[PDB]
Design a protein around this ligand. Structure first.
Ligand SMILES: O=P(O)(O)O[C@@H]1[C@H](O)[C@H](O)[C@@H](OP(=O)(O)O)[C@H](OP(=O)(O)O)[C@H]1O
Ligand SMILES: O=P(O)(O)O[C@@H]1[C@H](O)[C@H](O)[C@@H](OP(=O)(O)O)[C@H](OP(=O)(O)O)[C@H]1O
Ligand SMILES: O=P(O)(O)O[C@@H]1[C@H](O)[C@H](O)[C@@H](OP(=O)(O)O)[C@H](OP(=O)(O)O)[C@H]1O
Ligand SMILES: O=P(O)(O)O[C@@H]1[C@H](O)[C@H](O)[C@@H](OP(=O)(O)O)[C@H](OP(=O)(O)O)[C@H]1O
Ligand code: NA
Ligand code: NA
Ligand code: NA
Lengths: 361, 361, 365, 367
């Protein structure tokens, strides 16, 4: 029972059909955009119809940087005009004779859907990476120029979604250690995660091991998921935001050890305040999540990613008779990990047609 | 013509002003940190702003897919309340008088037992990790439930990374020459090597005149004479790391045949400029800053454990003689002469506000 | 019926005899090495036989296709002439006089004393998961013959020399004032509710083979349950020459499956005997001799004398009782608190004849 | 111009011909023994002729059967009467049969991968432990029947050749041999440091070994002598546990190292039997009296093969010994030295009939 996403040009001459709103990047390769265009043959008589795939970084409401552009012709028909995917072949049978397939590939050097609308707190403007599928018609009423009317066009803002690769990094571990002014004995903090990659909505078990050899009490153990956003085109904007926090019930008294697993799930739903954090879509959309971790490929300059998003676990220890007397600094350590969507899973179908426009809240 | 260094907090509730970036250690005493904090009495209502001096030794860098490993020891901490207030200096009264009645003063003094600004980022060849001694001036604001728990807001605080720079003391006695001699017996016949420096204590930028006397009563020929300034770095907290780096060199290739005797004075200037590779070398600041120099000779006051200095930096002149006569596989003999390297001694109204940020190269 | 230990040269010229394989350090003083050298004057014609005592810290192991790396520091050296006799070792001792008779006037005495600033026999061989290398403190008694030339050349003949690896064994001092109970308590507040843990031992000093009664007193005023109580004897080893190597290893363990639910307390006495015999894996832990030898035990606690830099002990050995309480959630997964009580582990206080003769070579397994 | 080694039996019935005296082991594989037997057809009528290859460890002799013996390999083929096609397998066999005539029969005896190379040792007066060695014997012999159902193997109808299995180097090599030793003497706060490196891990008999020594002398004592040795180590691992360590090359540096100085120097050594007056007490690949005898090559043990079936283990190592002023007698009764292991062996190996010259197999003596 396959849901097909459709949108029609104002002048009803061009209709575009897509199998998905969201196209999978799993590092090794990126799922191509395979769709079809239905033309009104009376309204495109003498005209040409193309489909473009554009990736561009934007900043303000001001600045724009194209990261990728590709374009194919659907009308008049090109060569055999036969589909390459079953989804196309099936949509052509279902929709009829005025149905032409397009395939637009993704390269490997592009980022995934990431955008950020600042909070009042924050300096630096709106920015993001958009992916646009546009079908449009060109025509000529005079030999001096071709024209591209908007009314004959239809654009879909698709998402490039980060799904997990085959392999995974080493088990994240961190060991931090402190001697406070006039303390002979150290405070020791070890932190481990079960694995290096976590899926959106998967619980993260943070194992904390506090060895307190000091004469002071560890009053509080706090664990955060911090999101770190580096805008790396146009403006060098930096955001670090808590997207999950768990405070332990336990203190660690003098000359004692405590090992403890706190579980956090970093989710957009956790944050009432959705501005000031890297999302994979607009705040107003229902299907908007936290941005997945950026995966910079070998040899690719990080600046062409536009916005860098990473995640870390911050473990903060509150120590008795410290803040005000022996330090004005926090006692903390951080452990990197990557957040993204799950590994992708390895006759004709039955098609339901829906508006492309994403459901709001 | 007095450049004052200013930095303003995130929320603009607290602004700090210092006389200097760099504070002079001349062994006898260390010049204190006197400055003022500018407040916004609205955003500072029901609050008490503090200023702290922290000296910390830190060890451990950030490596991707390597266990995060970190050590910090606070070698000194000290705090004073700047607002509401409770002697004074000309520069305090002057800045007060020239800024407003929102400017309140602070004086933080250094004890005698701290090292000077020393830090180190390793080279690919090197096994140890990044480490350094940092000096932080932090002005921060707190509420009444900021002492009921331990929370000091990130945005109502500003920090300056000042240097503690090693200068020679004021009224030093006359210095003997740094010198040693060696007799290398070859077939029971002496090759006498004498190395002499004009003095013991040289300044950064000061040419070092090295006198080398080779008296050859051997059947062998001295085919090559090389003269180095070597920096020796010993990390003495957390990890027993050892660095020995040429920071100046002169290869003479002047021959000294049998029953002959050659004296030669070379001039070397140990400078950070002399080498592209600023890694694997003890510096007084970050590699990327222009005002950063080679670290000065560590000075250990008697009755102080060398370990509390964190990183021990020393300088020596190394002389390598290449010797042959066998047929041909040549031997190399080497000796060193220690010397101390630091900044020159010191002696004994109108403002242009610069931002504390240090210029890059 | 006193057993005497004998070893002979390759050239069968010089043969050495000792009262013991092992010499007692009891903190107040160390037992001196009194022995005799039998040498047939035929095969040492116009030579000088000497006996030396060497204490050496050593570091490094042989690995195929791995750079050879070794360190040696000599912590003590002393030498006496035995042939031809002078008053080299002062007055003889009861054992020397008695041994002279039994082996004729080819037999000559020696006395080498230990100073007070030395460690005791400690050595370690790393386990697969250990970062550091083989290291130990060895004690060598060497009897060796030399000519007027041999000293100048640096050529003491290995043929006309014999060496013994003796042990310096840590016994408790004769004079001990009755010992207090080694005890402590902690309060692990959980949601501002105390989980009181008290640990106590009968005394502070235990002997090898002696059972250690650990008394554990959990007072649970929390809303959580102590699911498990684990009690370990941990040996802690710090190599303090050449390379700062760290070993912490379980040498005895008792895991008691006891619940301690809210508004409930539990007192409990587990008895542990830390012994090398408990461990299949004899690597990764401080011993007083080689793994191969059967007389090899766990290293005794290092005793640092007043005004001695601990670095000249080479290897620091200490023992602790670790108590681990596994504690429930309110569940998903469970926490774990842990404390330590230090104790010292060493050998008990110290206490004409017929002589049986034996080889020095220690019995293997 | 290929030299062919031959020996004829006392009774003149059996003559054996070999291409070489010495067969190459290069780790990967071992050269087989390919040869021929010339029979006198009158003298082998109703007789069977065989060729055996035997590898045996012995200890005691080198009469009465008073020595310990352990066999490591035995193979035997038949050459007469003719077996199957009776045709050559190698070009050397084809050529010899052509040259020698119709009474010439080929034999091929192969070597497995689990055997040592030629090693033997006659002790010196200073050594306890007796003569021992690994022998390789090629024996061609004739059997015949008697009427009382007892076959006979007369010594007069046999020819023994004592061949050598010679170790040549494999295609690969171990990493550059390096060693770092340091010493802190009693009452010293300063280390004496010695670093030793060799150019490579495998050297060839006759090849100069460049031993690079770096002495860092941070002490107040003088290094008055640097001695570099090639030591040969021999463990007999069958019957008796005899251990030998002998200097087979020695250089003494002319340089002393004064207090608070460092010296880097490369000494060159050639471990050669030639340079050894005393040929007893060291591991050789043959008899002392023979001219073609050399130092035994390093034993190369194969993964899974118990070392005891090598009979004699031979290894080599550089020893750098430092003589320190006023140390020996005052501060130590032990030597100041480090060892670097290396392996010693022979170099790597790689349309018309050959022209043959025949010589007695008997190896030339020293004279
Ligand atoms: O009319 P146009 O020029 O095509 O532009 C549309 C417009 O920007 C809508 O706001 C947007 O929907 P949202 O506000 O919900 O993002 C839609 O995205 P869509 O193509 O994904 O429906 C765009 O196509
Ligand atoms: O944002 P914060 O909390 O102030 O911290 C700044 C941060 O650590 C920068 O890496 C550092 O860069 P530079 O050393 O290159 O300037 C700067 O040094 P600074 O204090 O010397 O400006 C710090 O202030
Ligand atoms: O033959 P040498 O040169 O005297 O050296 C002996 C050799 O190192 C043995 O391996 C060793 O026995 P272990 O391996 O059993 O220790 C013995 O020590 P010992 O005193 O324990 O017999 C040493 O004396
Ligand atoms: O009479 P047999 O049983 O053949 O025994 C031969 C005899 O022992 C020779 O002395 C020996 O030569 P060396 O004295 O030179 O060792 C020869 O070796 P070879 O024929 O293999 O050379 C032996 O085969
Ligand atoms: Na487009
Ligand atoms: Na501070
Ligand atoms: Na040998």
């Amino acid at each position: 029972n396959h849901v097909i996403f459709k949108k029609i040009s104002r002048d009803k001459s061009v209709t575009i059909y897509l199998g998905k709103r969201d196209y999978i990047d799993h590092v090794e390769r990126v799922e191509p955009v395979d769709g079809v265009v239905l033309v009104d043959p009376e309204l495109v008589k003498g005209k040409r119809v193309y489909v473009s795939l554009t990736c561009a970084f934007r900043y303000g409401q001001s600045f724009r940087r194209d990261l990728y552009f590709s374009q194919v012709q659907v009308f008049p028909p090109v060569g055999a005009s036969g589909a390459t995917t079953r989804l196309q072949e099936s949509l052509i049978k279902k929709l009829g004779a005025n149905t032409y397939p397009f395939l637009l590939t993704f390269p490997d050097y592009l980022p995934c859907s990431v955008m950020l609308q600042p909070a009042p707190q924050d300096v630096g403007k709106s920015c993001g990476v958009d992916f646009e599928i546009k079908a449009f018609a060109t025509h000529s009423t005079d030999v001096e120029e071709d024209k591209i009317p908007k009314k004959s066009s239809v654009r879909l803002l698709i998402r490039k979604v980060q799904h997990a690769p085959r392999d995974m990094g080493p088990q994240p571990r961190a060991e931090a250690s402190w001697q406070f002014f006039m303390s002979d004995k150290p405070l020791r903090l070890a932190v481990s995660l079960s694995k290096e990659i976590y899926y959106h909505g998967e619980p993260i078990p943070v194992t904390v091991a506090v060895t307190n050899s000091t004469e002071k009490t560890v009053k509080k153990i706090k664990v955060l998921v911090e999101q770190v956003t580096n805008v790396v085109l146009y403006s060098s904007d930096y955001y670090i935001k808590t997207v999950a926090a768990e405070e332990a019930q336990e203190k660690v008294p003098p000359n004692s050890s405590l090992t403890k697993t706190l579980t956090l799930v970093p989710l957009l739903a956790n944050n009432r305040e959705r501005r000031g954090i890297a999302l994979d879509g607009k705040i107003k959309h229902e299907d908007t999540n936290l941005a997945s971790s950026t995966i910079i490929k070998e040899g690719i300059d990080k600046t062409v990613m536009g916005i860098l998003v990473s995640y870390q676990i911050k473990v903060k220890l509150t120590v008795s008779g410290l803040l005000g007397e022996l330090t004005s600094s926090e006692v903390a350590t951080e452990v990197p990990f990557r957040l993204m969507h799950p590994q992708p899973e390895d006759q004709d179908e039955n098609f339901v047609f829906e508006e492309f426009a994403r459901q709001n809240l």
